[PDB]
């Protein structure tokens, strides 16, 4: 999230820039909420400061993001549903060779019908290279995990490289299945069943 | 400059309201110029207050 337009532009943010608004009156929201930690009118003044700090570009109707977020997934279960969880799902992620001294972090996760993931087994996932720093302790009651850090070197992933027929998640943290870890020239690996 | 001009009608023997210098045509002005005609128009419309 970001308050103003220029807050993501003066800081050299990398990513898709989305200018959004909701159909509500944002002003009278600022008088309903207590526990605001300061002046209750001061935050309305601070809202005006951010509204004037931004550039004069037209925002684009928060439903334009929310339909992308919900509606492909809801349409997916009407035809992917109860085929098999083993062979409708697949995941993209970075792959390190086994020859290490003391691995597959996930990048996206794809759910599709059988023919689509069979069409996803080709379209080779080389020409994509990162540098994975992988060193952490186990943190939660789920199995062995190390919160790694991957920095993509080459070009980023096109969407028509994936499909028009296969839904995929948009956000993901990084972890792999003790010891240490250093800079590894990782590559991608499409796994499925 | 309009509302103070209205308020100055009440106080005549103390303060007097004039149109400022450099609201007139620059350098005397000439009829042959386009800008000085509109400057005279603005000035002659604003004077009677």
């Amino acid at each position: 999230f970001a308050h103003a337009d220029s807050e993501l532009l003066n800081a050299n943010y990398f990513g898709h820039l989305l200018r959004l608004k909701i159909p509500y009156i944002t002003e009278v929201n600022l008088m309903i909420r207590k526990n605001r930690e300061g002046g209750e009118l001061f935050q309305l003044v601070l809202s005006y400061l951010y509204k004037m700090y931004a550039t004069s570009a037209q925002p684009k109707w928060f439903g334009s993001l929310l339909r992308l977020l919900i509606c492909p997934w809801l349409h997916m279960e009407k035809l992917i549903g109860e085929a098999d969880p083993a062979s409708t799902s697949a995941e993209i992620g970075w792959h390190v060779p086994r020859e290490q001294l003391m691995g597959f972090i996930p990048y996206v996760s794809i759910r599709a019908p059988r023919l689509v993931i069979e069409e996803l087994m080709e379209k080779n996932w080389g020409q994509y290279h990162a540098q994975v720093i992988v060193t952490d302790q186990l943190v939660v009651g789920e199995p062995r995990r190390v919160s790694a850090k991957a920095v993509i070197k080459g070009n980023h992933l096109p969407v028509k490289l994936i499909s028009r027929f296969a839904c995929f998640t948009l956000t993901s943290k990084y972890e792999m299945r003790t010891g240490r870890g250093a800079a590894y020239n990782a590559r991608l690996a499409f796994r499925s069943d | 400059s309009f509302r103070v001009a209205l308020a100055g009608w009440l106080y005549n023997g103390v303060v007097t309201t004039v149109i400022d210098d450099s609201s007139y045509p620059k350098d005397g002005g000439s009829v042959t110029s386009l800008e000085n005609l509109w400057d005279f128009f603005i000035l002659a419309l604003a004077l009677p207050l």
């Binding site: 532009l9 050299n12 004037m52 700090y53 004069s56 070197k153 | -």
Partner: protein
């Protein structure tokens, strides 16, 4: 005396004593290859140095702690550095280097970067990437030179061994302090000895094509290879410019503080404005006398038509009325420990009180002492220093003063309260007036104008109408841009009654964004175009449609024109920003992408619209924001008297504003400062940070004037300095002579001490002549073909020609036609007689004399291409082609030069002068610099292609296209048919008046009946003008009025030879 015993007969040839010859040139060039690098320092060990060269070199240069605390590794795993003093401390630091070295074979003492560290860096070690980053950037900083420095120092030792010279004009010797009184060479000797110490072979680094080698000692730091290239420039310029040594010692002292600093290049970046600030920005606190020019520019002021009308003396009232300098100029020295330099400059500057050549040469010699090096840093910090800044808008335009979108464009309602409506209406009127032109609508012109990311080592298809309406503002609406005539602008603007304000915009690429400028501009172009163009498509984009919410009543469909369809597709590109991609070869594992709002550096269309945006905001400053924000009606009266058509000139980011003199004298110099504060306040409201300057001078396109002065910047380009951006190897050997000629022709335009400068140019010219492949070698006449004047040949007077002589066949015509009755005597003076008489040289065999002296072979060998055009075997092909010209014996010159040599001229009487002698026109040139001082007064300074070739080729031979057949053009265009051009040297003079009036094609005693040009083929006159004006410029001294005397074969049969050359092509 070692150099004397080695180079006896050559130094006398280039000092005016003995005649120049090819065999002495080649026997010297045999020895120039045969020098060890230690031999140069052995030759430096023997010269006795005086007491006024000795100054304390600090001990702290040699002991610098290593580079581990300087760099680090950022997140995203790219290497950076942490800065210690200031956020711009991103240059190369100075540390101990020797610990990262392994020695070369064949010689123990010199090492390079070790292969194990780059292996582990390619593997991905943390420290090894930092170490190879530092090693590669130190190599790239040390590499920025043209040739190894020992060759330049050796050329200095050869050229300046002939003692003082003699002037044929002033009839006396010159007084220039010799090598004993030369402080940069004393320091260059002491540093290079103290590095080595007990170790022999005494060269701190050697220079090769791909990489360098370092002397393996703890005394070696990274600051030394820029420091030595910095000292060699001052050691040459102290000789060949006649610098005062009291300024050269300060110039060396600042460089020693730079080497003793934390970083070298960063200190020079922060200290690059000491010499002009103390000297040039503080001249004439008390003015008492001197002459100044009297220009005026003619009344259609957009034409920039100037006129010189005499010169008047100065008066007492024209002193420096500009504000003071002391409070910040002393502060700059007190911050960096240079108060002993700054106070030394100020107390010496305060002693000049008259405007003559002396005080002008003081400014030249003070500006020369700045260090011209090329700042070196990695691209991965060049980007993240330059492209991370952003403009700050202190007064943005409110959200009420916009409507809803027309597609992706919001329009600006004209009832806004901000200043942006004046920006809006100029671009709107510009688009509305360019769309109504008939030329933008035939398909041929659209095809002609047809004819993602960007990186560093397709925007031009859709960003057309922005550029197309920028050109209309620059050339039709406000003709303030001068996009050759920049000189008389500043000579008027630097005069006594008028002042000038040097306005420069900082960060012109980071200046304009979508916040204030691009949104209003793309709203204006989307509306000015849609009136004239309705449905009519552009080149390749069709018409379209997009919804709108212009009025808040309803929404509707409103079809898009097709020319504004590009505005629709292009504003979404400008709305987000640009994407860059980097990969430096100076640090491995460093390869990423980056998102900015800035523009690319050196595009073409990125200049024109910035100039339009400069002039528009300056006009709305002088019109609206000016009177609305100030008291003090002197300032109001000053603002209401000037407009940008009458006084404002801009070419890029920078601008120049001229405030003329009134009847009462000059303008009060305090109200000008009160207006300067308002310019600085005006820039803050929309993001521009002006770099305004008011001292009494004029700065425009980096040219420095004071009272109309033509001050050259000697340190604008160095001698031994060359830019290298990549890490790739350079071109092979026979293309270095182009840069050596570049050194010479750049020394021409700066007013060097000309006997010293030609004499040093000979030493370089003979040093760069031989290379291993029998070896390759150019004779000395091959360089005379390239525009290099001579000293004393064929038994003539010494110092007899000038460097204003042209190059090529027009150059070869002139000195031969001046020296010919002496040359034909010198040939017969040793057994070169034949029986028949030639029409040129008489009874002497010029063919055998020129073959044995190898003049022909140099003449044809200089015309070989120096470009190894599209491997070492192609280099060997070019070498065999170049050797074949030397082995072949020749019969005569080219057909053009032989057709030239039938024309004889005469020097009857000198012309009346064109300008005052006591007027200082140009800096550096004075009666002490005798020959340019005579040429520039006698001629006068300039104060006022394949199609054109081939159509004249077919027109002069017997054969717009209906217009050319009968008209004529001037001489400089009509005489390009035989490829004659006015050379680079004559550009700062008045060749037009000399061609038009003072070269007569008619003898003084009437008509000799031999010089009869027919009424047919009257194009010959335009070439005879050049052949006349050659010798009237090559002969040193006064440019003389020249009359035609003889054409041997007749004027009718003269041009038939030119027609044979035109048939032969």
């Amino acid at each position: 005396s070692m150099i004397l015993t080695q180079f006896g007969p050559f130094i006398e040839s280039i000092s005016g004593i003995t005649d120049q010859s090819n065999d002495v040139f080649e026997n010297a060039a045999k020895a120039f290859s045969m020098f060890t690098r230690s031999d140069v320092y052995k030759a430096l060990d023997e010269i006795p140095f005086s007491e006024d060269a000795m100054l304390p070199i600090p001990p702290t240069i040699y002991t610098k702690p290593s580079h581990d605390s300087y760099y680090y590794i950022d997140a995203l795993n790219r290497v950076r550095r942490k800065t210690y003093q200031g956020p711009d401390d991103v240059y190369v630091p100075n540390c101990s280097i020797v610990e990262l070295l392994e020695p070369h074979e064949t010689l123990t003492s010199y090492g390079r970067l070790s292969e194990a560290i780059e292996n582990r860096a390619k593997d991905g070690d943390s420290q090894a990437r930092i170490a190879t980053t530092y090693g590669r950037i130190a190599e790239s900083q040390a590499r920025q030179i043209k040739a190894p420095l020992e060759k330049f120092v050796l050329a200095l030792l050869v050229a300046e061994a002939g003692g003082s010279l003699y002037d044929p004009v002033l009839q006396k010797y010159d007084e220039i302090p010799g090598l004993s009184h030369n402080c940069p060479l004393w320091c260059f000797r002491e540093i290079c000895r103290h590095i080595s110490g007990p170790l022999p072979d005494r060269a701190p680094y050697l220079y090769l094509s791909a990489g360098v080698f370092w002397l393996m000692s703890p005394r070696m730091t990274s600051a030394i290879p820029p420091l030595l290239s910095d000292l060699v420039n001052l050691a040459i310029l102290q000789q060949t410019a006649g610098l005062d040594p009291s300024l050269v010692r300060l110039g060396v002292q600042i460089c020693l503080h730079a080497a003793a600093s934390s970083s070298y290049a960063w200190f020079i970046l922060k200290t690059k404005s000491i010499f002009p600030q103390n000297t040039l920005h503080s001249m004439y606190e008390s003015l008492e006398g001197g002459y100044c020019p009297n220009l005026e520019w003619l009344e259609p002021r957009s034409d920039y038509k100037f006129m010189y009308m005499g010169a008047m003396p100065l008066s007492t009232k024209y002193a420096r009325s500009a504000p003071s300098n002391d409070k910040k100029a002393r502060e700059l020295g007190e911050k960096y420990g240079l108060s002993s330099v700054v106070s030394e400059l100020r107390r010496r500057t305060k002693t000049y009180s008259k405007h003559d050549f002396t005080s002008v040469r003081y400014i030249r010699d003070a500006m020369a002492c700045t260090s011209g090096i090329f700042l070196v840093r990695t691209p991965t910090e060049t980007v993240l220093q330059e492209y991370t800044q952003s403009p700050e808008i202190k007064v943005p335009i409110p959200q009420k003063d916009w409507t809803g979108p027309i597609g992706e464009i919001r329009i600006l309602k004209d009832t806004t309260s901000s200043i942006a409506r004046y920006l809006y209406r100029t671009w709107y009127l510009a688009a509305a007036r360019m769309a109504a032109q008939p030329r933008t609508w035939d398909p041929l012109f659209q095809a002609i104008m047809r004819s993602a990311d960007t990186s560093m080592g397709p925007q031009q298809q859709v960003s057309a109408p922005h550029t197309l309406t920028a050109d209309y503002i620059n050339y039709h609406m406000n003709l303030s841009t001068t996009s050759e005539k920049v000189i008389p602008l500043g000579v008027y603007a630097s005069s006594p009654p008028n002042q000038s304000i040097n306005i420069d915009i900082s960060a012109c690429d980071a200046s304009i964004t979508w916040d204030f400028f691009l949104s209003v501009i793309m709203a204006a172009i989307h509306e000015g175009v849609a009136s004239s163009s309705i449905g009519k498509p552009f080149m390749g984009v069709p018409a379209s449609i997009v919804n709108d919410e212009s009025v808040v009543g309803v929404r509707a469909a409103r079809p898009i024109s097709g020319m504004q369809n590009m505005i629709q597709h292009l504003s979404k590109l400008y709305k987000r920003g640009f994407s860059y991609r980097v990969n430096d070869s100076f640090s491995p594992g460093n390869d990423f992408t980056h998102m900015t709002t800035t523009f690319p550096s050196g595009s073409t269309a990125t200049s024109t619209e910035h100039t339009a945006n400069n002039s528009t905001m300056m006009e709305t400053f002088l019109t609206v924001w000016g009177p609305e924000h100030t008291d003090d009606p002197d300032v109001l009266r000053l603002m209401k008297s000037l407009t940008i058509q009458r006084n404002y000139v801009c070419q890029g980011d920078d601008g120049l504003m001229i405030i003329d003199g009134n009847t009462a004298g000059k303008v009060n110099s305090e109200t000008i400062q009160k207006m300067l504060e308002l310019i600085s306040k005006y820039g803050e409201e929309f993001g521009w940070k002006y770099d305004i300057a008011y001292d009494g001078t004029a700065e425009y396109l980096k040219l420095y004037f004071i009272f109309g002065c033509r001050i050259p910047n000697l340190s604008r380009h160095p001698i031994v300095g060359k830019e290298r951006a990549n890490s790739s190897a350079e071109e092979p050997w026979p293309a270095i002579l182009d840069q050596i000629m570049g050194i010479f022709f750049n020394g021409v335009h700066d007013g060097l001490q000309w006997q010293r400068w030609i004499r040093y140019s000979w030493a370089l010219c003979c040093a760069f002549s031989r290379q291993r492949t029998g070896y390759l070698q150019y004779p000395m006449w091959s360089f005379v073909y390239w525009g290099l004047p001579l000293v004393k040949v064929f038994g003539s007077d010494p110092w007899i020609f000038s460097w204003y002589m042209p190059t090529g066949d027009l150059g070869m015509y002139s000195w031969i036609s001046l020296i010919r009755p002496l040359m034909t005597r010198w040939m017969v003076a040793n057994g070169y007689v034949t029986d028949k008489c030639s029409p040129v040289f008489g009874n002497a065999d010029y063919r055998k004399c020129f073959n044995e002296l190898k003049l022909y072979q140099g003449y044809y060998m200089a015309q070989l291409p120096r470009n190894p055009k599209k491997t070492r075997e192609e280099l060997a092909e070019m070498d065999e082609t170049l050797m074949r010209a030397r082995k072949h014996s020749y019969s005569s010159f080219s057909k053009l030069l032989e057709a030239y040599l039938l024309v004889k001229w005469r020097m009857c009487e000198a012309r009346e002068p064109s300008v005052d002698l006591r007027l200082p026109l140009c800096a550096g040139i004075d009666p002490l610099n005798s020959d340019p001082f005579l040429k520039m007064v006698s001629v006068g300074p300039m104060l006022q292609n394949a199609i054109d070739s081939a159509l004249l080729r077919l027109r002069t031979l017997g054969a717009l296209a209906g217009k050319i057949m009968l008209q004529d053009v001037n001489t400089v265009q009509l005489a390009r048919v035989v490829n004659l051009a006015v050379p680079d040297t004559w550009m700062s003079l008045d060749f037009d008046t000399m061609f038009k009036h003072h070269v007569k094609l008619l003898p003084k005693d009437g008509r000799h009946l031999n010089t009869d040009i027919p009424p047919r083929m009257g194009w010959l006159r335009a070439i005879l003008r050049f052949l006349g004006a050659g010798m009237a410029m090559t002969a040193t001294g006064v440019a003389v009025d020249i009359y035609l005397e003889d054409i041997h074969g007749g004027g009718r049969s003269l041009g038939q030879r030119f027609m044979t050359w035109m048939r032969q092509e």
